[PDB]
Amino acid sequence: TDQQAEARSYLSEEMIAEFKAAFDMFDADGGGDISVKELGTVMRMLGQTPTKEELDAIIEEVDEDGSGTIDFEEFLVMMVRQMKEDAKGKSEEELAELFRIFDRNADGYIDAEELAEIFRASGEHVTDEEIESLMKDGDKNNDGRIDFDEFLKMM
């Protein structure tokens, strides 16, 4: 499908070959797709405890031809979804802790001094004017402050 072709174009040949090796390990009978039986089996062998309904939910999430099983191109979609979700999570979680730390007076906002120290502590030389412009551009609602959602969006 459309979506399977996008997922593949996102991955290197090298990643795809590593995913095919894992897929071949789920596909216990070599038949070409992962069943409910097979998915639960390796999930339980990796210390997970899914319910049958959770096994069904996972399959249906990527099950584009309605077979009730996962073929390799569907597997690759499950993998790209997981990576992008990981990545997105890691970034927000890190920027949340950066905002926390450099909001040194704990008023809930980042001002131009605090913003200038984020950049210096990061090892990037920035000018005062650079900082004040980022402040301006970043201040979307024009209250003169940078709140968290403006911070996120700015970085």
Q: What is d(CA 101, CA 97) in angstroms, rounded to the nearest whole number?
A: 6
9 annotated as a binding-site residue: no
**Residue closer to Ca ion, measured from CB, 117 or 139:** 139
C-beta atoms surrounding 53 within 10 Å:
8
Strands (E), 41-148: 70-71
**Binding of Ca ion by 103 (CB under 5 A):** yes
Stretch that binds Ca ion, among 3-11, 13-21, 85-93, 132-140 (CB under 5 A): 132-140
- Tokens 């301006």 identify what position? 136
Q: Can you tell me whether residue 43 is helix, strand or coil?
A: helix
Rounded to 5 degrees, what angle do the CA atoms 10, 27, 66 make? 70
CA trace torsion 96, 100, 106, 110 (10° rounding): -70
Stretch that binds Ca ion, among 14-22, 80-88, 92-100, 105-113 (CB under 5 A): 105-113
Q: What is d(CA 80, CA 95) in angstroms, rounded to the nearest whole number?
A: 23
67 annotated as a binding-site residue: yes
Q: Please report how close the Cβ of residue 45 comes to Ca ion at its closest, in angstroms.
A: 15
**Binding of Ca ion by 141 (CB under 5 A):** yes
Stretch that binds Ca ion, among 13-21, 80-88, 96-104, 118-126 (CB under 5 A): 96-104
Report the candidate in 85, 84, 55 with the shortest Cα–Cα distance to residue 70. 55
33 annotated as a binding-site residue: yes
Compose the 18-57 pattern: x for residues touching Ca ion by CB under 5 A, - for all others. ---------x-x-x-----------------x------x-
128 annotated as a binding-site residue: no
Contacting residues toward Ca ion, per CB under 5 A? 27, 29, 31, 49, 56, 63, 65, 67, 103, 105, 107, 139, 141, 143, 145
